[PDB]
Design a binder for these strands. Sequence first.
RNA 1: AGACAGCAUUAUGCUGUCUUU
RNA 2: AGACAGCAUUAUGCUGUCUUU
Lengths: 70, 70
Amino acid sequence: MDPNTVSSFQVDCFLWHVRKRVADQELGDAPFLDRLRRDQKSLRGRGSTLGLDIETATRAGKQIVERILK
Amino acid sequence: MDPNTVSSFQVDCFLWHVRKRVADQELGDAPFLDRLRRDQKSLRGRGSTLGLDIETATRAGKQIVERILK
RNA sequence: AGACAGCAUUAUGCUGUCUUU
RNA sequence: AGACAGCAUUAUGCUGUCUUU
């Protein structure tokens, strides 16, 4: 696998999860929710193409984000 | 200000900053960088429409996300 | 009715990953 | 050449915010 393809997928998965939690807390406006829906479909297609699992990639993206924010 | 319009802007600003830091660490693929550029333009337009500053909104988004992830 | 951003559907151009004799 | 996702430009439909008769 191309390293940056995988890391970008992982980060994108984690950031989608963050956005979902924001939406769950009733903080999203209608466009924010529209983007959440579009991006869920996008990540599903990307995940399938890569043979990777979004839930697993989410944990990896969390690790990456935690590293770069310290 | 519509509450969810402002919170969505703040979260989006913070998540853009996170993606920029990911890019700076050479972890982004070309599409990831393409979206970073598009979303920068989008946030500038949204910020201008709202009369808000992206840098200040980034800090608010950080607080929101930290609260959400606790 | 205007400004801004997005989403959906279409077109055209392009980028990336992977497969491909 | 195929699959997937995106970006750019353009068309149409729509959503939200704000402004405005």
